[PDB]
């Protein structure tokens, strides 16, 4: 299966690259009629069969790809793009490593997902299913990670689903900022990361190094310790300002975000997020107060209460001071979904709904079959669970949240989405420049670290961020299950129309944040990102409402 | 421990100041009563010292004082920034080399606690080599570019830790393999893997669909971790190279860092692997030079009488096709001294004779006390063992060999050096401009790539390489045991004098290669190296002691 898989993974990636770059208007595909297209580059022509969806984005059949008689390889296409994107020799070598890092991961997913139907795939352990997700749907090399070779990818990247222990440091209390809140204490957090047996071994070394209550334990991602801290802070280690204790405790598993880890040894309700310096103190310390505010909003607001939306909090955070110390040394503790989940509930990332099995059966169809609901009622439930809370939060409180497939978690019970769980706010949270009374409750500590922008800036966080970057990849799979894209977005508009009817006192707010303008504003093609005039395209919400 | 952090910094400052004063970067002004002062921009260094016969200071580190500031190597390095015209990036480079050296010195201080000079010479030969102080000339003799605390502790010799090798598979057609004689790959593999591992290795070999068209290539784990897994990720992703993983015996690093000893099973074959930290004809043709010197030492009677041994390289390999592949992927198998030692003989590096125990008791004195010999006869033996063979090789055959403490092994028997074993000299060797008939026998494959030199400059390889870089650090320990430096070098001259008197047919050769000229030339060093134009002429101790 060596040669067969290598060709399949290269074809899938070439098709992903061509389709997204054509949607970004880097080049324009010419119709050859009969569902056949060609895309012309300098010194090469790509021919294939495709169908153009409601967003203007091509659904390319990877098996039909032809480049004359050259073998279909992503490496070949990348070299053909050097003149198109005006890349230096070094910029190409960087993308090669990101390119080959992606093919390696895609080969792993192909091997690990073999013989598994969509029904099989949705029955995996939630943490294993998350590991097997294809990754970010927009970026060409979505598993490239600067400086990570085959060893680091396999040990720490999620698509390999390997586990590892954390490295532990000791730091003087006067050197660290600690924002732990509520009933949590260091001993509790340590108990979440170490079983009583490892905590004793940890304490033994703690006393063997002559440390006392003036020092605090700091966990460190082993890659961060291996590549950055053991070297960049070697002076602090030799002088004694910091002490390296070694690896202790439970085994951890990487999520799609790579920096946030799930405990695989003991399901304890707290995830951990650690620095990974691949490519400050105020922003990291305000999150615990931003979560506390959004939690109060979702509890009070009836519309958000009724949607079931959950705000996963950050109860504890830390970093080092006396700027490099702050970004590279620190820890954040996050609330695991299992704290808020019912016994029969299971979490999935919404990106799961973009997946298909070996035989191109969408996983979303597997959920629908198990729900016993017809597709239309199932989609309506999904839209009321996901889009209504986010749009209501924006129009009422002037608050925008990044709504991607990898930071939206769905609670699933017997194939139905029960409610949404949100977890990422910090650098991803934005506010409206307008002064809404409903925003007066926000602490200044958060206002100063969060960007405030005009309404048209914030729509994209929901149009581009959720509709273009998530729904664009779900509606084609529904079209394959008997729900055309036109109908798909009719249901979304109806959920949004019904919702706005129910809040006539916000008539003006909805005009200020309209999702039904005939066009959507584009993001300029400023340096085309391949790794994790006034131009506009047609809005499916407006297009599907017209006779 | 504050006490140890002060000791290591004081010892390092003294080494830096003395060696830089000898290099005439600055001059120590005598203040009388054995007290010296060294003036730098913005700081003065005062201390007591005794200047030796080479003009190199012996500094009492306890007497170090620099105005108010605490004696730290970090402080001195910043004070040298203007003196050596170092950029901010070069300084940060040397800081990591500096603290990496202090870390190693801290380890050596721990592991050598409570151990007398007699105790030290009783240690296993491999452990004793690990506990050596390192290179005596360079300020930061344990700095290795890119190596942090983790990398140092796992693979550097001063920590004495062991590790398994990584193993790759490469196609025969992409490899130059020059195994010779009876040796085969199966033999070499059996030297690196016990039966249970050889079988677990062969399973992974088959699991990757490999056959006799591929060859195993061992790789240093740091080399795999940091360089190959990333730089050659394209080759791994495409299948030109296959990563098999770690297998086999545990290996221990030598002073050269790249050459390793088998610590699990003594097999008599050391391995030398690439470490790309800072073209193929050099690495490849040298073994024909070792085989040639082996023939010279067996033929020549003077060298047969000395017992000098040339350690061979019976197998070597590197990759070619698709430069980088040659330097970064390859292996050299070296003969271990034990293949040529007698049961009653133990090996030590000659650098061992520069060491003292905690109480400043020289280890060279311990070797003497066991020998039952007076110091003077012991030294005569050492000089006959080490200097005579190297000097004879030069005068008769026009061949000069690097002769520093780290590449000179001594065969020790009841405290007495019997003979010398020579190892790493693929690129430290030099030949004379003249055409000597005794040299016609040298393979042109060697002659073309090893640098040619004139006689006057060909001495410095022997004077600077051995006398100034080795004996300069041994004669001070003898003076502390009742053998003044003047006498020390009187004995060396007598051995040479007695030797030359026995070969009067070389009188002209000795004139061209005279070690008794009253002065030594010193090559200017505008680029002063801190990690492992002219200066005023230097007095030749061999001429001084003859007066």
């Amino acid at each position: 299966m060596n040669h067969k898989d290598w060709d399949f993974v290269n074809r899938q990636l070439v098709a992903k690259m061509l389709a997204e770059l054509e949607y970004e208007q880097v080049f324009h595909a010419e119709s050859q009629g009969d569902g056949r297209y060609c895309i012309n580059l300098p010194g090469a022509q790509w021919r294939f069969s495709a169908e153009r969806g409601i967003w203007g984005w091509l659904w390319i059949d990877a098996q039909t790809l032809r480049c004359a008689d050259e073998p279909v390889l992503a490496q070949t296409l990348l070299m053909q793009l050097k003149p198109v994107l005006s890349m230096s020799d070094a910029t190409v070598a960087e993308h090669m490593q990101d390119l080959y890092a992606t093919l390696l991961g895609d080969l792993q997913l192909l091997k690990a997902r073999r013989g598994l139907s969509a029904s099989d795939l949705i029955d995996l352990d939630a943490d294993r299913l998350q590991c097997l997700l294809s990754g970010h749907p927009k970026f060409a090399f979505n598993k490239g990670r600067r400086g990570w070779g085959k060893e680091a990818l396999e040990r720490y990247a999620p698509e390999y689903a390997n586990t590892f222990r954390l490295h532990w440091l000791a730091v003087k209390r006067e050197h660290m900022v600690w924002r732990c809140d509520g009933s949590l204490t260091i001993g509790t957090l340590l108990a979440a990361a170490m079983d009583p047996q490892e905590f004793a071994r940890f304490n033994q070394v703690w006393q063997d190094n002559g440390l006392d209550n003036d020092w605090l334990p700091l966990p460190v991602h082993p890659w961060q310790w291996q590549q950055k801290i053991s070297l960049d802070f070697i002076a602090d280690l030799a002088e004694g300002r910091m002490v390296s204790l070694g690896e202790f405790g439970d085994l951890w598993l990487a999520q799609q975000s790579l920096r946030t880890l799930t405990n695989a040894s003991r399901q304890g309700g707290l995830d951990i997020k650690l620095p990974l310096t691949i490519y400050p103190g105020k922003y990291i310390a305000a999150g615990p107060l931003a979560s506390r505010w959004l939690q109060q909003v979702f509890a009070t607001d009836a519309t958000l209460k009724q949607s079931g939306a959950v705000i996963l909090g950050e109860p504890a955070a830390g970093y080092v001071s006396h700027y490099r110390y702050q970004e590279m040394l620190g820890v954040i503790w996050r609330e695991n979904p299992c704290r808020w989940l019912k016994p029969d509930e299971s979490p999935i990332l919404m990106a799961t709904l973009m997946e298909c099995d070996e035989n191109n059966q969408p996983l979303i169809g597997a959920y629908i079959d198990r729900s016993g609901l017809d597709a239309e009622t199932w989609l309506t439930q999904l839209f009321r669970v996901v889009v209504v809370p986010l749009y209501h939060l924006l129009c009422r409180y002037g608050v925008a949240l990044i709504a991607h497939g990898q930071n939206i978690t769905l609670a699933m019970k017997k194939g139905v989405p029960q409610r949404v769980l949100l977890k990422d706010f910090q650098g991803d949270m934005r506010l409206v420049k307008d002064a809404f009374p409903e925003m007066d409750s926000l602490p200044q500590e958060v206002r100063d670290v969060t960007a405030r922008l005009s309404a048209d800036y914030l729509i994209h966080d929901l149009q581009t961020g959720h509709f273009v970057t998530v729904l664009r990849f779900v509606s084609p799979l529904m079209a394959r299950l008997g729900v055309p894209e036109r109908r798909f977005y009719q249901l979304l508009a109806a959920v949004l129309s019904d919702y706005m009817q129910e809040h006539p006192q916000m008539s003006a707010r909805f005009a200020l944040f309209s999702l039904f303008k005939p066009q959507i504003i584009r993001v300029v093609l400023n340096p085309v990102k391949l790794t994790w005039y006034l131009e506009d395209l047609q809005n499916p919400l407006w297009l599907a409402t017209r006779d």
Side-chain angles (χ1 to χ4, degrees), chain A residues 2 5-35 37-110 112-171 173-178 180 182 185-206 208-212 214-240 242-266 268-281 285-291 293-295 297-321 323 325-326 328-343 345-401 403 405-412 414-425 427 429-432 434-444 446-448 450-523 527-528 530-531 534-546:
Chain A
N2 225 38
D5 293 341
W6 180 248
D7 175 70
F8 178 84
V9 176
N10 267 278
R11 286 186 180 268
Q12 299 287 113
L13 181 54
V14 168
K16 183 182 174 179
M17 295 169 67
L18 292 175
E20 191 67 27
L21 292 170
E22 202 270 355
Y23 180 67
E24 290 295 339
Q25 292 184 328
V26 174
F27 38 66
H28 295 81
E30 295 183 53
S31 170
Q32 286 189 351
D34 178 25
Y37 292 83
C38 67
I39 292 170
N40 291 337
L41 301 172
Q45 173 184 61
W46 290 91
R47 298 178 66 253
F48 58 85
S49 302
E51 179 181 354
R52 194 181 287 282
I54 191 167
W55 289 97
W57 170 64
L58 294 165
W59 311 340
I60 293 179
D61 182 351
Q63 283 296 316
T64 67
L65 282 169
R66 296 288 186 274
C67 191
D69 279 336
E70 294 213 71
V72 180
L73 301 170
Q75 182 246 42
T76 308
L77 174 60
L78 180 57
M79 297 304 296
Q80 297 169 352
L81 296 173
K82 184 178 176 179
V84 179
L85 300 176
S86 308
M87 332 182 96
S88 58
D89 292 342
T91 301
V92 175
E94 291 180 5
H95 288 152
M96 283 295 175
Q97 290 177 345
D98 295 338
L99 179 154
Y100 284 110
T102 301
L103 298 178
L104 284 170
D106 293 352
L107 289 166
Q108 183 61 33
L109 296 173
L110 189 59
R113 290 167 59 163
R114 231 191 278 280
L116 299 181
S117 65
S119 300
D120 289 351
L121 286 170
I122 59 173
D123 281 349
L124 281 67
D125 177 72
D127 296 330
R128 177 52 55 93
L129 176 57
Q130 171 169 183
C131 285
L132 299 178
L133 294 174
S134 302
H136 197 273
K138 181 179 176 56
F139 292 104
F141 312 136
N142 63 4
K143 296 177 191 68
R145 306 168 177 98
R146 181 60 52 81
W148 287 35
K150 186 167 177 289
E151 187 78 352
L153 294 166
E154 291 181 1
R155 282 183 180 173
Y156 308 125
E159 59 269 19
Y160 300 94
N162 284 319
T163 62
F164 52 93
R165 286 185 180 175
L166 301 177
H167 194 83
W168 291 90
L169 297 179
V171 180
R173 184 177 286 271
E174 63 176 354
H175 291 351
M176 215 184 310
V177 180
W178 186 243
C180 176
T185 184
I186 305 301
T188 298
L189 299 170
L190 295 169
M194 301 178 185
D195 63 14
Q197 202 157 328
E198 291 283 304
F199 177 88
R201 188 166 68 92
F202 176 80
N203 239 90
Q204 182 67 51
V205 180
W206 182 270
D208 295 334
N209 289 270
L211 301 170
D212 60 27
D214 258 319
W215 294 81
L216 293 180
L218 176 63
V220 177
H221 193 290
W223 188 94
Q224 186 75 351
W225 167 254
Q226 186 182 123
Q227 299 304 316
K228 297 299 185 183
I229 296 162
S230 69
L231 178 61
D232 298 354
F233 303 99
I234 189 169
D236 290 329
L237 294 167
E239 283 173 349
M242 285 167 30
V243 178
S244 168
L245 279 59
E247 297 183 349
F248 299 98
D250 293 336
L251 295 173
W252 292 86
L253 175 70
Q255 302 178 7
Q256 288 291 131
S257 67
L258 191 58
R259 286 182 59 197
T260 305
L261 315 175
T262 300
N263 192 322
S265 302
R266 305 182 304 151
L270 289 177
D271 296 336
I272 192 169
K273 181 178 181 178
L274 297 164
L276 289 175
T277 307
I278 293 171
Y279 298 93
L289 208 76
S291 303
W293 185 79
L294 288 172
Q295 288 172 328
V297 175
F298 282 39
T300 297
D301 187 273
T303 301
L304 301 168
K305 192 172 178 178
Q306 292 167 355
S307 73
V310 176
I311 295 295
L312 297 173
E314 293 181 354
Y319 62 84
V320 179
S321 58
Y323 64 90
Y325 293 127
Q326 297 176 344
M328 300 179 71
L329 290 169
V331 61
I332 297 170
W333 295 91
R334 277 191 183 173
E335 206 171 354
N336 183 318
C338 83
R339 259 149 109 94
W340 291 91
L341 294 175
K342 288 183 219 315
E345 279 179 344
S346 180
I348 66 169
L349 298 181
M350 188 163 174
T352 305
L353 308 180
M354 311 173 186
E355 299 290 337
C356 293
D357 67 10
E358 255 186 283
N359 306 118
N360 287 321
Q361 298 295 330
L363 272 61
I364 184 160
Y367 290 120
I368 288 171
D369 298 339
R370 289 199 185 174
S371 69
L373 304 171
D374 65 348
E376 289 190 348
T377 300
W378 193 101
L379 274 63
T380 296
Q381 183 67 10
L382 176 66
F383 296 151
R384 302 168 69 200
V385 164
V386 177
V387 181
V388 176
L390 295 173
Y391 189 58
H392 176 68
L393 182 61
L394 170 60
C395 299
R396 172 111 175 253
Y397 303 104
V399 176
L401 299 173
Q406 294 183 149
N407 56 348
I408 291 171
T409 300
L410 299 174
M412 303 292 294
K414 301 192 170 55
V416 180
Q418 307 284 307
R419 54 195 189 272
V420 71
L421 282 70
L422 311 171
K423 52 184 68 172
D424 284 314
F425 7 89
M429 171 167 161
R430 296 185 182 275
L431 303 170
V432 68
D434 301 1
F436 291 175
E438 303 88 347
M439 256 183 71
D440 291 355
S441 305
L442 186 63
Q444 299 299 148
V446 180
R447 296 179 186 170
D448 302 341
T450 186
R452 296 189 72 187
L453 301 169
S454 65
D456 282 15
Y457 264 118
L458 296 178
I459 289 296
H460 293 282
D461 252 1
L462 186 57
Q463 275 186 337
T464 306
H466 190 70
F467 298 173
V468 178
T469 309
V470 181
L471 273 48
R472 171 160 65 100
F473 299 98
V474 181
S475 65
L477 304 177
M478 280 298 106
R480 208 195 301 164
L481 298 173
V483 179
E485 286 191 309
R486 181 177 180 79
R487 183 62 176 163
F488 182 100
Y489 296 95
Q490 279 175 348
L491 276 63
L492 177 58
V495 170
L496 292 167
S497 288
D498 293 354
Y499 155 80
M500 290 187 289
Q501 272 194 5
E502 298 175 347
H503 297 82
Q505 74 285 354
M506 303 173 186
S507 176
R509 295 289 178 86
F510 295 143
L512 185 65
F513 297 113
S514 170
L515 299 169
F516 296 88
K517 288 183 175 87
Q519 292 94 6
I520 294 170
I521 298 172
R522 270 185 177 90
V523 179
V528 175
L530 296 176
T531 314
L534 67 92
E535 192 54 30
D536 54 0
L537 61 89
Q538 284 182 348
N539 182 2
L541 276 61
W542 180 88
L543 187 56
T545 309
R546 296 295 173 280

